[PDB]
């Protein structure tokens, strides 16, 4: 029975439940219900000058959907002063969310991406919760019960989430896309505390993923009221089957998964990382043991992050001249650079935060190039600006590395980016608004966008650059030939 199964699991944890202190209970509640910031408290902290800016800021021009929405709620009550202001206010509007801190950091909670005092608070709570979850599901119950988790598609990757629901009929799933999603999804990792239902729960808004999970005998867990279980963090899941199913006259994605030791999955990730480095060290003429490609993977869409990297690098190789690729990559390797493919947020990537002490200067986005570490960083799960796919965004980031190397060759001592040279600056104030909306941001991003579009698979997109921005077009080709001939 649905009910009998519930009472049985509750009984198994009954002693554990009664044994909880009020402090333990409050901790579990805080984990389930994050402490939101009070808009009252925020606005009261702002000066008079400041208060006014928020109302005048066009907020949707940047920040994440949640943050821009919350700020709008404050509004009723970008210039260089406007970005710097938001970059600081962003630090004050974050909810205290234990599961989110664990997900964002992939469990590396010492990452200096948040205020030291709050960082330690998260750490204490996490360590105490780990201590609460000490009783395993056991050898009797584990193969007699299923546990369930409804999930938003956008949580794994917001790229597929955009068009995975059939645009024609929203009650059905896009078959082709589903087949790709299914073929690259073989294993999953939970770095935070999964909160699962004992009995399957009817889907709510944007819950088209319905996980069915079998635990292992030694999977630690704790009963939560109203028929739920909290599972220990740091577990692995093997994807046993992905199917399209029909529930109450509508289609969903069944995900069957079995809990396995996380270390077993990390083994597969490190093997894959070893493999992809072997293949590309050869193809690029690098020393066999060069560490170039990093899989920084800790979350629920783990395997696709790995598989996506292979395709991204392949597109990168198919659309950019071999000599340019070899020249620039060797330069990055000379600076111990990396191609980092990850599902944790970029402020928690060492190749960024090592060179950025100020948290308000740390950036989370779909992609980044960090000159100080000669590294390209690509975040799988998130959505890009305006961008067709991750392959193109990678080419964009590689554009930044191209900018980097070109300016270096110009002046090997006190190196700079060519987009800081007087020639491109003037080119930019002329042709800076002739390409993508994001190309307008600055010289660097304009260069990178132009570089990207000049290497698009679509013919039309590369002539556009040659058409709408011929000076930029020629300038880039000049840098390319200059680099190759170096
Ligand atoms: C799709 C995708 C999206 C981005 S992005 O984060 O939106 N982006 C701009 C983007 C047009 C290329 C970032 C960027 O410039 N990185 O260096 C900005 C937001 C700092 C990065 C990689 C990608 F593959
Ligand atoms: Zn960029």
Swiss-Prot record:
Zn(2+) binds at residues 396, 400, 438, 445. It comes from Bacillus anthracis. Sequence repeats lie at residues 17-35, 44-59, 62-77, 78-93. Its EC number is 3.4.24.83. Lethal factor (LF) is composed of four domains: domain I contains the first ATLF domain that binds the membrane-translocating component protective antigen (PA); domains II, III and IV together create a long deep groove that holds the 16-residue N-terminal tail of MAPKK before cleavage. Domain IV contains the catalytic center. It is an enzyme of class 3 (hydrolase). GO terms for biological process: proteolysis. The active site is at residue 397. Residues 1-32 are annotated as: IIA. Binds 1 zinc ion per subunit. It comes from the Bacteria. This is Lethal factor. Lethal factor (LF), which constitutes one of the three proteins composing the anthrax toxin, is able to trigger rapid cell death in macrophages. Acts as a protease that cleaves the N-terminal of most dual specificity mitogen-activated protein kinase kinases (MAPKKs or MAP2Ks) (except for MAP2K5): cleavage invariably occurs within the N-terminal proline-rich region preceding the kinase domain, thus disrupting a sequence involved in directing specific protein-protein interactions necessary for the assembly of signaling complexes. Residues 38-93 are annotated as: III. The chain holds residues 299 to 809 of 809 of the full protein. It catalyses: Preferred amino acids around the cleavage site can be denoted BBBBxHx-|-H, in which B denotes Arg or Lys, H denotes a hydrophobic amino acid, and x is any amino acid. The only known protein substrates are mitogen-activated protein (MAP) kinase kinases. It is found in: Secreted; Host cytoplasm, Host cytosol.
């Amino acid at each position: 029975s649905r009910y009998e199964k519930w009472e049985k699991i509750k009984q198994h944890y009954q002693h554990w439940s009664d044994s909880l202190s009020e402090e333990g209970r409050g901790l579990l509640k805080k984990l389930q219900i994050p402490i939101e910031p009070k808009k009252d408290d925020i606005i009261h902290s702002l000066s008079q000058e400041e208060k006014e800016l928020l109302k005048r800021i066009q907020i949707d021009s940047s920040l994440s959907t949640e943050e821009k929405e919350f700020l709008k709620k404050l509004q009723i009550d970008l210039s260089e002063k406007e970005k710097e202001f938001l970059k600081k206010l962003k630090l004050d509007i974050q909810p205290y969310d234990i599961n989110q801190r664990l997900q964002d950091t992939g469990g590396l909670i010492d990452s200096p991406s948040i205020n030291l005092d709050v960082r330690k608070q998260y750490k204490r709570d996490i360590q105490n919760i780990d201590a609460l979850l000490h009783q395993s599901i056991g050898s009797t119950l584990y193969n007699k019960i299923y546990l369930y988790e409804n999930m938003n598609i956008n949580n794994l990757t917001a790229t597929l989430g955009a068009d995975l629901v059939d645009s024609t009929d929203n009650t059905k799933i896009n078959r082709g896309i589903f087949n790709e999603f299914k073929k690259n999804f073989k294993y999953s990792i939970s770095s935070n505390y999964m909160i699962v239902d004992i009995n399957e729960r009817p889907a709510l808004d944007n819950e088209r993923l319905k996980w069915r999970i079998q635990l292992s005998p030694d999977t630690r867990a704790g009963y939560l009221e109203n028929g739920k279980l909290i599972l220990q963090r740091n577990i692995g899941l093997e994807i046993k089957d992905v199917q399209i199913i029909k529930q109450s006259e509508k289609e969903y994605i069944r995900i069957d998964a079995k809990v396995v030791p996380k270390s077993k999955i990390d083994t597969k990730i490190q093997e894959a990382q070893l493999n992809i480095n072997q293949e590309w060290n050869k193809a690029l003429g690098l020393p066999k043991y060069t560490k170039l490609i990093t899989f920084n993977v800790h979350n629920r869409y783990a395997s696709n992050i790995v598989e996506s990297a292979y395709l991204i690098l392949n597109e990168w190789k198919n659309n950019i001249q071999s000599d340019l690729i070899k020249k620039v990559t060797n330069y990055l390797v000379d600076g111990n650079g990396r191609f980092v493919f990850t599902d944790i947020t970029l402020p928690n990537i060492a190749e960024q935060y090592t060179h950025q002490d100020e948290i308000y200067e740390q950036v989370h986005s779909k992609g980044l190039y960090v000159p100080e570490s000669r590294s390209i960083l690509l975040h799988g799960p998130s959505k890009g600006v305006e961008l067709r796919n991750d392959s193109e965004g990678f080419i964009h980031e590689f554009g930044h590395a191209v900018d980097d190397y070109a300016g270096y060759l110009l002046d090997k001592n006190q190196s700079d980016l060519v987009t800081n040279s007087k020639k491109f600056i003037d080119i930019f104030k002329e042709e800076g608004s002739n390409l993508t909306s994001y190309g307008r941001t600055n010289e660097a991003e304009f260069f990178a966008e132009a570089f990207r579009l000049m290497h698009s698979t679509d013919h039309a997109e590369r002539l556009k650059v040659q058409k709408n921005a011929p000076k930029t077009f020629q300038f880039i080709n000049d840098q390319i030939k200059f680099i190759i001939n170096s």
